[PDB]
Amino acid sequence: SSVTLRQLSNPYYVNTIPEEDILKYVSYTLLATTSALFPFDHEQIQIPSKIPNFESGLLHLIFEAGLLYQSLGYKVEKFRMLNISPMKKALIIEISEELQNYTAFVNNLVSSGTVVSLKSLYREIYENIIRLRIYCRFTEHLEELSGDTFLIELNIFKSHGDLTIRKIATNLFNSMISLYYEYLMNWLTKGLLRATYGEFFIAENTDTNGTDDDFIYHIPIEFNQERVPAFIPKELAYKIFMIGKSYIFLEKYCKEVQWTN
Amino acid sequence: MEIKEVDDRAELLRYTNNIPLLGKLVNHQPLWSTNPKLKSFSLEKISAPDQRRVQEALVVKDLLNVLIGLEGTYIRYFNDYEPSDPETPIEFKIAKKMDPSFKTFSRRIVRYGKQYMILTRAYEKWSDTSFGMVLQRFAYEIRRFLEDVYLKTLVERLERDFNKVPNFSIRELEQIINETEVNKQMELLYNIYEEIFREIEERRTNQSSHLRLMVAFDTTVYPVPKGGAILKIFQQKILENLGDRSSVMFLKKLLNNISQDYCTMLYEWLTQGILNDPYQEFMTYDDLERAWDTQYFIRKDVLLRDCDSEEDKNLLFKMLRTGILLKVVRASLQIPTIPSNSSDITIQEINDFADLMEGSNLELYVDKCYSRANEIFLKLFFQG
């Protein structure tokens, strides 16, 4: 006629909160902050009776991002206080980077002023929801779990048919393997095992009982064959082990210091 | 309409041990049918011809939600709907007190919301590693489709017109859905879903039902069709859509964007001798993951073609041998890869599965690969 259907449906929804007002507090919910409209409880978002179940269904789909965001933020903060493997730091750092990207994205959508509806908002942030879900599941077990196990699992996901998944798995993998590489360098160039937290296959073993407490019969280095990662040939892992052992031998006992350096 | 109190609180799901990697991690909203937050308004009250457009406006508002999978105020999820259950079929019920012309339109429009939810849920299920990369890539493409095409059309065109266009109407919604052919794209996806789904159910049901090569068949039928078993569905569907150029174009595009990794995997097998199959979708698997004379197994169930004809058996064996000779060379030279300049034969990647499957092209592609494998191999054996 002379009006849009929205104008005609309007008089029946006059008791409820309009999408304009909802959008004004949505940006806060999406960053897991609290708000006057959607008080954000420890783990729950309170939706008022003033927003019908009709819209609530979408808000759950939208709000999931805020909740996922919150969860990942906590994973980061918990671990930030712990003495952990650099391999985990790599995972954590990547999560923080994702969260930073998420945040910027959301802030940009909101500041652009081009989001005028919740359906639009949802569609626009749809991918970000997916990305957070992926990370959230990968971080599900970020506790009581070694760096190598994660590298292995990520390698599976690097081959996943979903393009987003393989990209994420790849980035996580690369961020971690980079530090794995550093462990290998420390061993290979310095004979050094440092900050492994048990996440590196070559280990120090000084737990002696009189059987050479002074390490004059043996060098307290051993490795776990079963901990050698999939991307290193077992034969090579052996060579790696022996190079560092040889390094140690030459530097510590033969005192071949100028050469070794 | 009067507001009712429902303690509606959004939270993340506690149990994820039973959730697909890409499944939803948030609780579903309370349902209208058990916990409406609004006193309903019987539309009977506005059935009058002068108020009839209002009735329509209210109905359309629900249809927009139905299309994105949410229930409305007149259109509700049916009686056995169970939002916490990934196995529950979804149907909608239409308030009896409605203009019958809208009731019929609604059924025609509603079915798309139904398909939407099914496809959505199906791709989430398929995110598991247990389904194979071929299906996962398809699941990806479905998800991508819905984000960029289905919902994009819906919001940019329909939500927008609901809000902005005088004379916007229910009859228009039907026209638009068909106008953009989004319904055909969904119908095709839906039917692919149904075909794979029924195939899975049949497979699930059926629990009780010369070359110097170690070549054994693996006759295991997998619960989930993988590899060729999936690619065959697409091929068969294309063959059932013949003459519909728009539909087949869509399907062909889609297939080529599904088969892409499969093709890459095949390529490396044939030009490098590299077997890399973390999801067990490729025929030719072996042991160990010294002792080089291992048995190779043919997963009959993931093949692109049957292995009953003589011609295809010969082709399958040639592909097998090709990669093996290359595998030997890589082992012999202790190299990760054989460069293109290792021979006078250079082979391009497979960038079009459908084309490769057009007939003759596959055989020749393989012959070139095979010839190359022998060129390289023999040079090694008679020089190295």
Q: Which uninterrupted H or E stretch holds B157?
A: none
To 5 degrees, how large is the angle CA B253–CA A134–CA A41?
A: 135
Residues of chain B contacting A140 with CB distance shorter than 8 Å: 16
Q: What is the dihedral of CA B79, B80, B86, B90, to 10 degrees?
A: -50
| Cα B58 from Cα A229, distance rounded (Å) | 61
Inter-residue contact A29 to A106 (CB < 8 Å):
no
Question: Which value in Å is the resolution of this experimental model?
Answer: 3.6
The Cβ-side half-sphere exposure at A1, using a 13 Å CA radius, reads 13
What residue of B is the nearest CA neighbor of A8? B54
Q: Which residues pair with A221 in a beta bridge?
A: A204
> Residue B57: which of A9, A49, A126 has the nearest Cβ?
A9
Residue A119: closest CA among A52, A48, A62: A62
* Interchain CB distance below 8 Å, B139 and A161: yes
d(CA B303, CA B315): 12
CA–CA separation, B337 and B268 (whole Å): 10
**How many angstroms separate the CA atoms of B146 and B160, rounded?**
18
B132 to chain A: which residues are within 8 Å by CB? 161
Mutate to test the interface with A, among B2, B7, B12 (most CBs of A within 10 A): B12
CA–CA dist B56, B315 (Å, integer): 62
Nearest to B151 among A47, A68, A123 (CB): A123
Which residues from A are below 8 Å from B1, CB to CB? 12-13, 15
Number of Cβ within 10 Å of residue A97's Cβ equals 12
Inter-CA distances, A254 with A215, A218, B79, Å:
14, 14, 83
Cα–Cα distance for residue pair A236/A194, rounded to 1 Å: 21
Query: Alpha-carbon distance B333 to B340, whole Å?
Result: 15
For residue B310, the distance in angstroms to the closest alpha carbon of chain A comes to 33
Q: How was this structure determined?
A: cryo-EM
Residue in chain A nearest B50 by alpha carbon: A1
**What tokens does A223 get?**
């490795």
Tell me the CA distances in angstroms from B378 to A102, B55, B262, B269, one per residue in order: 55, 81, 29, 19
B193 CB-near residues (< 8 Å, 6+ apart): B118, B119, B122
Token pair 């239409």 is at which residue? Answer: B94
Partner-chain contact B21 A164, CB within 8 Å: no
Alpha helices in chain A (DSSP H): 5-9, 19-29, 53-80, 86-112, 118-138, 147-157, 163-185, 234-248, 257-260
Please answer yes or no on whether B58 and A9 come within 8 Å at the CB atom.
yes
Q: For residue B315, what are the CA distances in angstroms to B284, B303, B305, B366?
A: 13, 12, 10, 8
Residue whose C-alpha is closest to residue B268's, from B343, B216, B319: B319
d(CA B325, CA B380): 11
Query: A53–B38: do the CB atoms touch at under 8 Å?
Result: yes
Beta strand residue intervals within B223-358, DSSP E: 296-299
* Chain CA centroid to CA B95, Å: 34
- Calculated CA dihedral for residues A124, A129, A134, A140, nearest 10 degrees: 170
CA B179/CA B162 separation, integer angstroms: 17
Q: Are B58 and B40 in contact (CB under 8 A)?
A: no
Nearest partner of A99 among A62, A74, A124, judged by Cα: A74
What the block records as the tokens of A159 is 């081959």
- Residues paired with A40 in a beta bridge: A45
Please state, in angstroms and rounded to a whole number, the distance separating the CA atoms of residues B112 and B124.
18
Record the tokens describing residue A232, joined without a space. 């290193």
Q: Are A64 and B24 within 8 A, CB to CB?
A: yes
> Residue A53 and residue B278: Cβ atoms within 8 Å?
no
Find out whether A56 and A118 touch, Cβ atoms under 8 Å.
no
Tokens found for residue B146:
């819905």
